[PDB]
A paper describes a structure:
DasR from the Gram-positive soil-dwelling bacterium Streptomyces coelicolor is one of the functionally best characterised members of the GntR/HutC family. The DNA-binding sites for DasR are cis-regulatory elements with a length of 16 base pairs and are termed DasR-responsive elements (dre-sites). Gene repression by DasR is abrogated by several effectors such as, for example, GlcN-6-P. In addition to the regulation of the N-acetylglucosamine-related catabolic genes, DasR also participates in global processes like cell development and secondary metabolite biosynthesis. Members of this family share a common N-terminal winged-helix-turn-helix (wHTH) DNA-binding domain (DBD), but display different C-terminal effector-binding and oligomerisation domains (EBD).
While full-length DasR encompasses a homodimer in the asymmetric unit, DasR-EBD crystallised with only one monomer in the asymmetric unit and forms a homodimer with a crystallographically related neighbouring monomer. In contrast, β-strand β* is present in ligand-free full-length DasR and as a consequence, this ligand-free structure displays an ‘upwards’-directed positioning of the DBDs. However, in the case of ligand-free full-length DasR the DBDs are ‘upwards’-directed despite the fact that the effector-binding pocket is empty. The effector-binding pocket extends across both monomers in ligand-free DasR-EBD and encompasses a total solvent-accessible volume of about 440 Å3 (220 Å3 per monomer). This contiguous pocket becomes segregated into two individual pockets once β-strand β* is formed in each chain in ligand-free dimeric DasR, however, without reducing the size of the individual pockets (about 260 Å3 per monomer). At a first glance, the overall positioning of the DBDs in ligand-free full-length DasR resembles that observed in NagR in complex with potential effector molecules. However, also in this case, the centres of mass of the DBDs are shifted by about 13 to 15 Å between both structures. Interestingly, the overall pairwise orientation of the DBDs in ligand-free full-length DasR resembles that previously observed in the crystal structure of isolated NagR-DBDs in complex with palindromic dsDNA. Thus, binding of DasR to DNA with ‘upwards’-oriented DBDs is sterically impeded when assuming that DasR binding to operator DNA induces a similar conformational distortion in the DNA than NagR. Taken together, these data suggest that the crystal structure of ligand-free full-length DasR represents a DNA-binding incompetent conformation.
Numbering used by the authors:
A (entry chain A): 22 to 251
B (entry chain B): 20 to 250
Write the structure that this text describes.
């Protein structure tokens, strides 16, 4: 009751206020509406996750820009950021070989203990981290892939030119996830901010598995768009 | 500390990979005592696992190892067949219906004059009796004046649209994002209030390129996920 109108005014204070506007202090809001101070957290955290507010860990919480959009599709992260007026940067967090547990093997259609190239990228937009993306490929199926990536910006450019392998279909899973400590750290958010967790099974033009990708997108700043028929 | 979070989460994880669904998790206070870790940490690890779909919270009962999340293909077509595949049977329950006054965005979506009346429908979707989602459809009252009376005579909003009007969903744009369960939502779904949801916004067009519906929906993030086929 006291909660709804609170949310309603706050929701209406976005819409119109431009990003950067500081949100009134949580303890001020509790009195300005004679509501409990936890009822204020709730309303605010909803509006952070719903993307109208944004928490800056040193500074505070402010009216936010709309969430960044990306199409549910095998497509360019760079082209989509740019189309929205955002400079896209990436950062190679790690790249190394590992050995699959039995299921990563099931995914990659390789033997337990099989060697796997792993790649972790931090995706940025205007220099603000948005996602962490971890890609797994069968090292044996792609003998010297890492060494070849030196001379390439796009992993999928590398696979097409060098291995004559093109992504042709993917099964993709979208679900919720809380930001783990390691995740929150790389992304500069709270533990555990709600996340969009994407899992991608990709197969090429002759139908064999190419990669398995595990990705978490900031739930406060990100959304995905799908376009459907009939 | 940090190690304690890892060890507690490693442990419960292994429990989920080696015990059958339904296997009961000790209550939070037991875990804190057995792991000599703050209740904060225990709640966090528990919460990560529930949202990931590994553990399931049941309000009056407790936490258990879970069956996997319910999956639904992103597609205009049948919610029902896919549900029946995974071993669930879908049922719905009309929660509310009536007319409301459109805001400017709603008017923009539905292509009407702000203040124009909007038929609003609200259903609760369950799987094996268990609440999964709240689905809220918005249609232009001016465009479909006869629609609301029609509904009682049809199993589906869309056959109604196809029957009374010659109106068919041709295309749609769907947005997926994160949301926290509001108190009304948590109430109707039988979940906690802070629960991460998958919020689905749908904007549908008929064959002639005209807006038909705007649908806002929430799926409980602990029991639910979406699958898309990309090509």
């Amino acid at each position: 009751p006291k909660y709804y109108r609170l949310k309603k005014h706050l929701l209406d204070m976005t819409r119109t206020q431009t990003p950067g506007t500081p949100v009134p202090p949580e303890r001020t809001l509790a009195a300005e509406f004679d509501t409990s101070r936890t009822t204020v957290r709730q309303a605010l955290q909803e509006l952070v996750v719903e993307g109208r507010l944004e928490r800056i860990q040193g500074k505070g919480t402010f009216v936010a820009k709309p969430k960044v959009s990306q199409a549910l599709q095998l497509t360019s992260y760079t082209e989509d950021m740019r189309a929205q007026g955002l400079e896209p940067t990436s950062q190679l967090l790690d790249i190394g070989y590992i050995t699959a547990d039995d299921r990563l093997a099931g995914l990659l259609d390789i033997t337990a203990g099989g060697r796997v190239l792993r790649i972790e990228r931090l995706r940025m937009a205007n220099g603000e981290p948005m996602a962490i993306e971890t890609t797994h490929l069968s090292a044996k199926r792609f003998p010297a892939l890492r060494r070849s990536l030196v001379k390439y910006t796009s992993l999928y450019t590398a696979l097409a030119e060098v291995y004559d392998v093109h992504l042709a279909e993917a099964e993709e899973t979208i679900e919720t996830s809380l930001a783990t400590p390691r995740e929150a750290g790389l992304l500069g958010t709270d533990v555990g901010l709600p996340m969009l967790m994407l899992s991608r099974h990709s197969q090429d033009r002759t139908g064999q598995p190419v990669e398995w990708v595990r990705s978490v997108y900031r739930g406060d700043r990100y959304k995905f768009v799908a376009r459907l028929k009939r």
